[PDB]
Ligand binder design. Structure first.
Ligand code: HEM
Ligand SMILES: */C(=C/C(=O)O)C(=O)Nc1cc2cccnc2c2ncccc12
Ligand SMILES: O=C(O)/C=C\C(=O)Nc1cc2cccnc2c2ncccc12
Length: 153
């Protein structure tokens, strides 16, 4: 459980993401793929890491980054009351895409990295810790739903 104050720190920095969801999404996915290139294998080959400029020019990558951050922002605004939003995400990510929790840890790391790089004034230790707790709760709850669907990843 997060405190109300911790939720507020989470949603305060999230409002900065909402000013430009696509740009944040691009930086987060580029960080993910550079730091953990194996995560490209969950998409069509082109399993090969392209240059940063090719990733920034990609209409498909920019769309993916907005798909992710739209869904995650709706989850964070529920302040832990997110069973109904996690249900369809667990369904697809466990049964169709097959995304292991360790890849959700990787993308959580990439989100925290970009938020710290772009908004340090809104992302000191207390806010970083609140965002860490919020993303740990997301991963814990999605993992329990994965198991309910028979996926142990
Ligand atoms: C914060 C974490 C994430 C969120 C909120 C998220 C959200 C979404 C949403 C909303 C969709 C579209 C609807 C659907 O298929 O469920 C989607 C599709 C997808 N996601 Fe995720 N995702 C996350 C993490 C990841 C990660 C880490 C990977 C891979 C390493 C991944 C792989 C996919 C794939 C392969 C698709 C299908 C894309 C396509 O067919 O074009 N997701 N995701
Ligand atoms: C590969 C690269 C290119 O520029 O031709 C390619 O099109 N394959 C591919 C990679 C990829 C990576 C991350 C997310 N989504 C994708 C793709 N999505 C749809 C079709 C192909 C994709
Ligand atoms: O565009 C597509 O049709 C498929 C994906 C893909 O990654 N192609 C590439 C394949 C490679 C193989 C070996 C080394 N480098 C690369 C490479 N380097 C940069 C950008 C793209 C690629």
């Amino acid at each position: 459980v997060l405190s109300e104050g911790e939720w507020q720190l989470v949603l305060h920095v999230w409002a900065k993401v909402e000013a430009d969801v696509a740009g944040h999404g691009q930086d987060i996915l580029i960080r993910l793929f550079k730091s953990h290139p194996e995560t490209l294998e969950k998409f069509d080959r082109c399993k090969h890491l392209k240059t940063e400029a090719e990733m920034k020019a990609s209409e498909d990558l920019k769309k993916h980054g907005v798909t992710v951050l739209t869904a995650l922002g709706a989850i964070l605004k529920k302040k832990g009351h997110h069973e109904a939003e996690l249900k369809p995400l667990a369904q697809s990510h466990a049964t169709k895409h097959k995304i292991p929790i360790k890849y959700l840890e990787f993308i959580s790391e990439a989100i925290i990295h970009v938020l710290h790089s772009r908004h340090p004034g809104d992302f000191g230790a207390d806010a970083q810790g609140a965002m860490n707790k919020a993303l740990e709760l997301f991963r814990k709850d999605i993992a329990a739903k994965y198991k309910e669907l028979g996926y142990q990843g």
